[PDB]
A paper describes a structure:
pmcDEC205 (CD205 or Ly75) is an endocytic receptor highly expressed on the dendritic cells with antigen-presenting function and has been widely used as a receptor target in immune therapies. MR family members are type I transmembrane proteins with a large extracellular portion, a transmembrane helix, and a short cytoplasmic region. Their ectodomains contain an N-terminal cysteine-rich domain (CysR), a fibronectin type II domain (FnII), and eight (ten for DEC205) C-type lectin-like domains (CTLDs). The functional studies of DEC205 show that it can act as a receptor for dead cells and may recognize dead cells through cellular keratins in a pH-dependent manner, as acidification usually occurs during the event of apoptosis, but the mechanism of the interaction between DEC205 and keratins remains unclear.
To investigate the structure of the CysR∼CTLD3 (residues M1- S627) fragment, we expressed the fragment in insect cells and the purified protein was applied for crystallization screening. Crystals were obtained in 0.2 M Sodium Citrate with 20% PEG3350 around neutral pH (pH 6.5–7.4). X-ray diffraction data were collected and showed two crystal forms, one in space group C2 and the other in space group P1. The structures of the CysR∼CTLD3 fragment show a C-shaped conformation in both crystal forms and they are quite similar with the r.m.s. deviation of Cα atoms of 0.89 Å. The CysR∼CTLD2 region of DEC205 has an L-shaped conformation that is also found in the crystal structures of MR and Endo180 and the C-shaped conformation of the CysR∼CTLD3 fragment of DEC205 is similar to that of MR at acidic condition. The structure of the CysR domain of DEC205 has a trefoil shape, similar to the CysR domains of MR and Endo180. The structure of the FnII domain of DEC205 is also similar to that of MR and Endo180, consisting of two β-sheets and two conserved disulfide bonds. The structures of CTLD1 and CTLD2 of DEC205 exhibit typical CTLD fold, and the two domains are associated with each other with a hydrophobic interface as well as hydrogen bonds, suggesting that they might be tightly associated with each other, which is similar to MR and Endo180 (15, 39). Notably, the structure of the CLTD3 of DEC205 is different from the conventional CTLD fold with two unique loop regions (loop 1 and loop 2).
Author numbering: 32 to 347, 356 to 490, 500 to 573, 579 to 627
The structure:
């Protein structure tokens, strides 16, 4: 994974370590010989001795001692609440300052310095470039000449830090250069001042789209997003990089519809008509680039391809007067024309209203047009300001305001090939957006100007209510019991969690709980009218319900109220 730590007994506060390969408790000193990291396959590596903690279960010996890490003893360890279990769920325990392994043991284990359980951080992989491994990640530990290395190696023999990528280096001799995170754009990166960002071109690599996402995320970067024709033309003419590589455009981690993994708006598009927005092969939810044609193809997320990372650099009201009929919101006014008409015609009517066609800049906005202006004919599309006239595509607002939010529906934005202008409408329960033929006579909306949540306390604005993410993973109820009242609040909660945890691994609490083990899930305090259960959920009774990001962003899953920890999202101002 990542960093060394010390293993601290709960009842004595003493740090375990091995002497002559046996586990004894000791007074935490500040040296090396009390340090452990996780290694691959769920092993605890004691750094000083180059041995892995293990448990011999042949016969009933249950001998708890150190082994070579390639040993065939039971070297795997998993956390259960606070205790650490291995084979058959024997738990790591202390007897008389001596390490044992016994059933239903009560001992408590926590990493010193901090006080989290031993499995609270997850195993970070480290991907490579170059070498002879086509990007495959390091296998820790690896063995060269009696020494078991737990991290990358600096040698005069290799360009920079390096690691073996199989479980048997001396035989397979398969290795690569470590892709670790950085500060400047040196040696591992490429400055490009025109775009304000550095580029990493992992040219001879074979990663799935998810492996690729993780390797840029670990480096403190993102998968490439292409935001402009200049950006696109740069990448097309670049020399010496892959002909086909992953980009961050994806329909996997979104609530629905295509998005940039880095959350930059999707307004510049360059779809290959052969593998477009609606994928030919059904279920292809990632997108690659063809640096020869310059086009973007939807593709199976599991294909092993090359990929490109990118990161930036860094620098050195209450209500609103509207004319009657119009709806006030922020400092703007909205009016929904029922008289269906085409796009250019609809634009012209809004100009004749001394307004323009609505530009939408927040889920808050989306919510007000869907729940306030209109509520019945959800099945009819409604025109929105957003339109392209270029090749490659570049949706823009009719009022020249910047494109911040692009709220595409599933398989949108579907641009036709070589066929401008391209207009955008909204339909469905959520106000989601699709591309449309500019002649369709739809209703439309005109937007015209009209007339405490401290940002230090941690608060973020979404209409009237304010939200806040408590940064520490904690048991249920600790900070609040959050009630999710509608599909719109869920949609805004997804944007929050997606923006907070680029790692895809944390969970966030809901207030929903089954207090008795009978089956009713109700908000720990409102009536559960809006549901958002994930597949095959609620799994079981007596639980506490959390959500995450990733494939199922925001979908509810029932956790064990006793052991499960998750971040707190809380709200006030009603």
């Amino acid at each position: 994974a990542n960093d060394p730590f010390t293993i601290v007994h709960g009842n004595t506060g003493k740090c375990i370590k091995p002497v002559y390969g046996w586990i004894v408790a000791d007074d935490c000193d500040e040296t090396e010989d009390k340090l452990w990291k996780w290694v691959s396959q769920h092993r605890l590596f004691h750094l000083h001795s180059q041995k892995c903690l293990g448990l011999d279960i042949t016969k009933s010996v249950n001998e708890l001692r150190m082994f070579s890490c390639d040993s065939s003893a039971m070297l795997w360890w998993k956390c259960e609440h606070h205790s650490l279990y291995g084979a058959a769920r024997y738990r790591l325990a202390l007897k008389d300052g001596h390490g044992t392994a016994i059933s239903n043991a009560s001992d408590v284990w926590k990493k010193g310095g901090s006080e989290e359980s031993l499995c609270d951080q997850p195993y970070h992989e480290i991907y490579t470039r170059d070498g002879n491994s086509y990007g495959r990640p390091c296998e820790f530990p690896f063995l060269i000449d009696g020494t078991w290395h737990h991290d990358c190696i600096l040698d005069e023999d290799h360009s920079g830090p390096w690691c073996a990528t199989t479980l048997n280096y001396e035989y397979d001799r398969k290795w690569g250069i470590c892709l670790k995170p950085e500060n400047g754009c040196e040696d591992n990166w490429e400055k490009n001042e025109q775009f304000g960002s550095c580029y990493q071109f992992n040219t001879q690599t074979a990663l799935s789209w998810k492996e690729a996402y993780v390797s840029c995320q670990n480096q403190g970067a993102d998968l490439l997003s292409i935001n402009s024709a200049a950006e696109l033309t740069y990448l097309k003419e670049k020399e010496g990089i892959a002909k086909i590589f992953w980009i961050g455009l994806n329909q996997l981690y979104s609530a629905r519809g295509w998005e940039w993994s880095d959350h930059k708006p999707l307004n510049f598009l360059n779809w290959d008509p052969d593998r477009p927005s609606a994928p030919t092969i059904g279920g292809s939810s990632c997108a690659r680039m063809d640096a020869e044609s310059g086009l973007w193809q939807s593709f199976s997320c599991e294909a092993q391809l090359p990929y490109v990372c990118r990161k930036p650099l860094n620098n050195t009201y209450s209500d609103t007067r509207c004319d009657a009929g119009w709806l006030p919101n922020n400092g703007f006014c909205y009016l929904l024309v029922n008289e269906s008409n085409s796009w250019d015609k609809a634009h012209a009517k809004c100009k004749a209203f001394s307004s323009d066609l609505i530009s939408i800049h927040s889920l808050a906005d989306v919510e007000v047009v869907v729940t306030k202006l209109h509520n019945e004919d959800i099945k009819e599309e409604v025109w929105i300001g957003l339109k392209n006239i270029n090749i490659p595509t570049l949706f823009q607002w009719s009022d020249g305001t910047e494109v911040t939010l692009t709220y595409w529906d599933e398989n949108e934005p579907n641009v036709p090939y070589n066929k401008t202008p391209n207009c955008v409408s909204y339909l469905g329960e959520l106000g989601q957006w699709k591309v449309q033929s500019c002649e369709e006579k739809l209703k439309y909306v005109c937007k015209r100007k009209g007339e405490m949540c401290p940002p230090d306390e941690g608060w973020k604005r979404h209409g009237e209510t304010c939200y806040k993410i408590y940064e520490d993973e904690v048991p249920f109820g600790t900070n609040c019991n959050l009630t999710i009242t509608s599909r719109f609040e869920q949609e805004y909660l997804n944007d929050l969690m997606k923006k907070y945890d680029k790692s895809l691994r944390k969970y966030f609490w809901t207030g929903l709980r089954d207090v008795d083990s009978c089956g009713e899930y109700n908000w720990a305090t409102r009536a559960v009218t809006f549901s958002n259960w994930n597949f095959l959920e609620p799994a079981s009774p007596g639980g506490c319900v959390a959500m995450s990001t990733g494939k199922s962003v925001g979908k509810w899953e029932v956790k064990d109220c006793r052991s499960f920890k998750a971040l707190s999202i809380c709200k006030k101002m009603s």
